[PDB]
Ligand binder design. Structure first.
Ligand SMILES: N#Cc1ccc2[nH]cc(CCCCN3CCN(c4ccc5oc(C(N)=O)cc5c4)CC3)c2c1
Ligand SMILES: N#Cc1ccc2[nH]cc(CCCCN3CCN(c4ccc5oc(C(N)=O)cc5c4)CC3)c2c1
Ligand SMILES: [Ca+2]
Ligand SMILES: [Ca+2]
Ligand SMILES: [Ca+2]
Ligand SMILES: [Ca+2]
Ligand SMILES: [Ca+2]
Ligand SMILES: [Ca+2]
Ligand code: NA
Ligand code: NA
Ligand code: NA
Ligand code: NA
Lengths: 162, 162
């Protein structure tokens, strides 16, 4: 697919923070980087592995892939790609924190657990190539205001602002 | 330039850790991402700005650009691009630390100063989007074994191994 139909471009423009022109430019890049119009987890993994040669980005890349892959069907289509870039780059602080929460909520149950947060920190450290546990412990002491071992989105947002 | 001449591919293959086939594959990607065959600082900046929407990667991207741009002429040619990826991805630990030293040595005088290191840490924090100063202070206490306020490559390597 070389170019998007104007009905699709319009739809994506109303649904994102991008202009009609930016949507078509983003699509040109997407297809050049993904000739099939869809990126599977292997290809997302390859991308990250090439950008971070000093470490092992496999774990963090998987976490990011799962946020891009909204419908969880194992592939990132252009609609999912451009929506993620729209929110992460031009969304409200509320929308951006909501996106980060999704990244951190690894099993998608609406709660971030201590284990989930430690997996994020561990993954970032591996990708790079005070420790993880003490980090998580402090974060949860400062955000888990009901001390139930889980962070809701409000807890994550309230603390992240603080 | 669609494809490289076999004399050039051979040269790059002997000069890098890549195979003849990998050199040509890397060139296909480079040209698709850089149609003119050369990336200036503006374009490198754009790339990083698109990958890190939550922060400001301008400062760190500049530091990385200067390492890629070995001859310091303001553009990254394919030969410089593939050499950087060769060292960062397949070099000895010694070669990889030497590359990191170049990144950190912002003015290229063969020494990393406290200010240079704080600029690196500050840039990484901005890109992301214990503090920087305390970090630098500890690193220099553990690596500046002659306490002259500068890190030579041997100091950086010895400590980085430690
Ligand atoms: N050892 C060590 C050591 C020690 C202390 C340290 N501090 C910091 C570091 C790491 C700093 C980052 C290095 N990055 C910069 C980006 N980069 C790169 C740019 C463009 C690219 O483009 C593609 C593509 N696929 O097109 C792939 C690709 C990759 C090269 C590797 C470090 C390392
Ligand atoms: N607020 C907040 C907040 C709070 C707490 C947090 N912890 C961690 C975060 C940030 C985590 C990373 C987010 N990245 C992932 C990569 N990514 C992306 C992937 C493919 C891409 O491809 C292109 C292209 N140009 O093709 C561009 C492009 C960009 C989207 C943004 C965070 C944020
Ligand atoms: Ca999907
Ligand atoms: Ca969860
Ligand atoms: Ca809670
Ligand atoms: Ca150059
Ligand atoms: Ca210097
Ligand atoms: Ca010294
Ligand atoms: Na729009
Ligand atoms: Na999630
Ligand atoms: Na080789
Ligand atoms: Na340098």
């Amino acid at each position: 697919n070389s170019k998007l139909k104007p009905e699709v471009v319009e739809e994506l423009t109303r649904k994102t923070y991008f202009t009609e022109k930016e949507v078509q430019q983003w699509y040109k890049g997407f297809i050049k980087d993904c000739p099939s119009g869809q990126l599977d987890a292997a290809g997302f993994q390859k991308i990250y592995k090439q950008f971070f040669p000093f470490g092992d980005p496999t774990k963090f890349a998987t976490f990011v892939f799962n946020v891009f892959d909204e419908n969880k069907d194992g592939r990132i289509e252009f609609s999912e790609f451009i929506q993620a870039l729209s929110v992460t780059s031009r969304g409200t602080l509320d929308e951006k924190l909501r996106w980060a929460f999704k990244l951190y909520d690894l099993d998608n149950d609406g709660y971030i657990t201590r284990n989930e947060m430690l997996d994020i920190v561990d993954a970032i450290y591996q990708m790079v190539g005070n420790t993880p546990e003490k980090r998580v412990d402090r974060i949860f002491a400062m955000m888990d205001k009901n001390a139930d071992g889980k962070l809701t989105l409000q807890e994550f947002q309230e603390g992240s602002k603080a």
